[PDB]
Subunit: 458 residues, 2 copies
């Protein structure tokens, strides 16, 4: 028997809440200050501003400027002895406004229209920073002390693969290790307005593959006797993957951590009802590689995948060109799951190609990110799940991992604290797109959930 | 017994007829004639028309289709005289981009005992050398002992567009001939004159796959099939590791080589398959390694080739997409018995049967194949005459691996066909600094003159 406020009620609460309003003006200022890692613009400016903001309400603040993007930490202390610690991880850099992106109003001007707030960073990730601070300060309106120690860590290079995050966390692990729970930088409601509460990221390894079959393109009259670069490469790739998408590389699945019973039960309960709908959404013309719902979800969340991002050889254009191309190349990737490390995955692929008779395929490592997940059974995570249900009428969607890539493995490796992601995004927030937005009611609801999480530590 | 190269060059220098047509060649080369660019076609056809008319030939320039068809007939007075036909083309490929040209491609240049220019080998030089041979003969005899017809088309480099129609129209003036001499021929790397009697064929076509409306984030790569995987799977289902084509009903249509054809291969085919590996710097094993297996595959079997394939992202860095589209440019090299349209339809059926109905196929070009076992007496005569002019001997092959209109010409004319000419293994047809050895050019003249004399 749970009752929930209406969207109209949430918006009025938001309008009447002096603390939420104070930090909404702070959000306006933050959005206005462009902070992009890849344009080197405004990182120190935003990191210092955040420093002042948190100092004002009594946090002990440290701004480490050792690497390109300053690393901001703000610790709020509880007077309770044997108090636990809560960590909020967030980032203050955003992607550029840019491209063929359509903006109704200036991307760096926080704009409110039709019950949504618009601006570069309102969802990813600055809005999450002002909402979580709002929550703490609201709790502080009605209490003399915090029931739990609270640490905010804000990096400035999340959109450029969290450059040097590993070096900041190693440097400051002593103050962070041992916390009860770490809440991730963002989260969203899904298409059914269920709050997604997730516990992992998949990883990836990307690499170039190249073949040189001869010193020059040869006349195609020789194609019956002379092997060409594209045939060799097609044969090589075809050797590494079954028609159902299973990867044919020895040693690879042996390293994969299989999902436990809880993880499989979570998928059953919370995974999309009809994942076969991707066919409609993208106008697929070929059948899915895995069609039954659970086979599909399990492949999607818990299996790796060998992907061709591009392949090219010989002649493109109008007309013909009677050649056996000397060179062929491809841009490949393997999506990873826990157990699989980028360099090692590539070495197993080198070995299998050599064993298959394709030693002339050259491989060149380009990028890697490690994967991470949990079965969402840590009691600190269970607490979050039960509290969230009191705030979202459509309920929650609990997932061991999302299919996105991110720094979760880096963070857990340094800090070893249980991690959970939830936030104030909507399925159509357009992160990284034009008119990035957050629903005003969703933003206020995240404040209330975070304040309730703090109260749960009393 | 055989003249030296130095003697040949001197003979060439002192021969007023050869020198006259060598200046004619200079002019032909200077006039760019490329079918694909529709440049110079009427200009070169008209100029040739006049060159032949001047020496008393009965000339017809048919301008019905894009490239004018030129015919020049020289009559013998002998009443039961046979007829000899020369087929040649006056169009060339362009000079081009990546190609290295020491001097202007459209300026005949002589260096180190070679002549250089676009068309000196393929095919303008063959035209002037053959008219030289006829006219040289006429310096020493009262009349031709055989009727001689020159047929010159201007679309050979573009698959002989409308040749078939011109031959249908003029077949009454041409059918009944004793022998037809093909457009060009070369000496092989061992300086043996190649004498051949066939062209392989070709069917080229685009293959395309659309797998979705849009490029999808590659995180879906374990559940959504992409266009490039589907296409690689389709292409691989059609070709065995050893190059054999896996298409039902294809090999059934292949005409097997007879005993003479195989014996010719064995005698005159390359001595060593592995030389190809050395020449091209091959980094992969040959698809057929034993000599006779290699040779039979090269001249007498079809082959499925990828000229190009592309999909998704090329460029700096990565792009986390499953591409929605992939395409390829394919061809099947053909042998007698295989027709372009039928071959492509058999590939359509196999792909559907194999589960690849979504690969789209678009026919783009086709040429039928042709060959003979080189036993026609009119052809044997050429093989014997040639042994008197080339100290390294001759190389007799039923077919070259190149493509050409032999099938179209035979279908209209039904005259025994033989290819021999003035190129060298390094003439670089279709390439930069295309060239003919001066001595080789004059030797061709003398061999063609002797061919005429053999009809007395
Ligand atoms: O049960 C063993 C492990 O299985 C993994 O798949 C889960 O992500 C872990 O949280 C769990 O500890
Ligand atoms: O008290 C708040 C929460 O703190 C976590 O450390 C405990 O594991 C939960 O059981 C508890 O509900
Ligand atoms: O023996 C039958 C036929 O075999 C074919 O392979 C040859 O090209 C023909 O010249 C011959 O007439
Ligand atoms: O007379 C020249 C040649 O004409 C051909 O028609 C005959 O078949 C040959 O035997 C002869 O040598
Ligand atoms: Mn983010
Ligand atoms: Mn030619």
């Amino acid at each position: 028997a749970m009752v929930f406020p209406s969207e109209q009620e949430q918006i009025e609460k938001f309008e009447k809440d002096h603390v939420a309003q104070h930090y909404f003006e702070v959000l306006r200022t933050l959005i206005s200050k462009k902070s992009v890692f890849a344009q080197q613009v405004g990182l120190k400016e935003v990191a210092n501003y955040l420093g002042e903001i948190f100092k004002r309400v009594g946090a002990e603040v440290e701004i480490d400027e050792s690497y390109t993007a300053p690393f901001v930490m703000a610790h709020f202390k509880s007077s309770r002895p044997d108090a636990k610690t809560l960590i909020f991880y967030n980032h203050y850099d955003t992607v550029p406004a840019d491209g063929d992106q359509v903006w109704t109003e200036d991307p760096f001007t926080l704009s409110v229209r039709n019950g949504f707030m618009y601006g570069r960073g309102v969802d990813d990730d600055k809005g999450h920073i002002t909402a979580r601070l709002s929550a703490l300060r609201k709790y502080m309106q009605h209490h003399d002390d915090l029931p739990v120690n609270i640490s905010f860590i804000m990096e400035g290079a999340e959109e450029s693969a969290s450059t040097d995050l590993d070096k900041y966390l190693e440097k400051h692990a002593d103050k962070l290790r041992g916390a009860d729970l770490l809440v991730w930088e963002q989260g969203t409601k899904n298409a059914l307005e269920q709050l997604e509460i997730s516990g992992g990221n998949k990883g990836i390894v990307t690499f170039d593959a190249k073949v040189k079959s001869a010193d020059v393109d040869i006349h195609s009259s020789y194609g019956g006797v002379v092997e060409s670069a594209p045939w060799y490469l097609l044969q090589a790739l075809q050797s590494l993957r079954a028609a159902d998408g299973r990867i044919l590389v020895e040693g690879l699945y042996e390293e994969v951590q299989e999902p436990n019973e809880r993880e499989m039960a979570l998928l059953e309960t919370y995974g999309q009802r009809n994942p076969e709908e991707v066919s409609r959404i993208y106008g697929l013309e070929l059948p899915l590689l895995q069609e039954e719902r659970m086979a599909f979800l399990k492949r999607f969340f818990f299996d790796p995948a060998l992907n061709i991002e591009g392949i090219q050889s010989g002649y493109q254009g109008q007309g013909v060109k009677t050649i056996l191309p000397a060179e062929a190349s491809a841009k490949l990737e393997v999506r990873l799951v826990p157990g699989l490390e980028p360099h090692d995955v590539l070495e197993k692929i080198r070995k299998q190609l050599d064993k298959n008779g394709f030693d002339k395929v050259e491989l060149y490592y380009t990028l890697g990110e490690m994967s991470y997940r949990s079965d969402m059974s840590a009691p600190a995570i269970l607490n979050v799940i039960e509290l969230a249900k009191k705030f979202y009428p459509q309920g929650v969607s609990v997932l061991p991992t999302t299919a996105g890539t991110g720094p979760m493995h880096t963070v857990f490796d340094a800090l070893e604290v249980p991690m959970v992601a939830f936030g104030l995004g909507n399925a159509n927030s357009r992160d990284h797109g034009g008119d990035e937005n957050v629903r005003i009611a969703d933003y206020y609801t995240h404040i209330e959930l975070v304040e309730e999480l703090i109260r749960s530590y009393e």
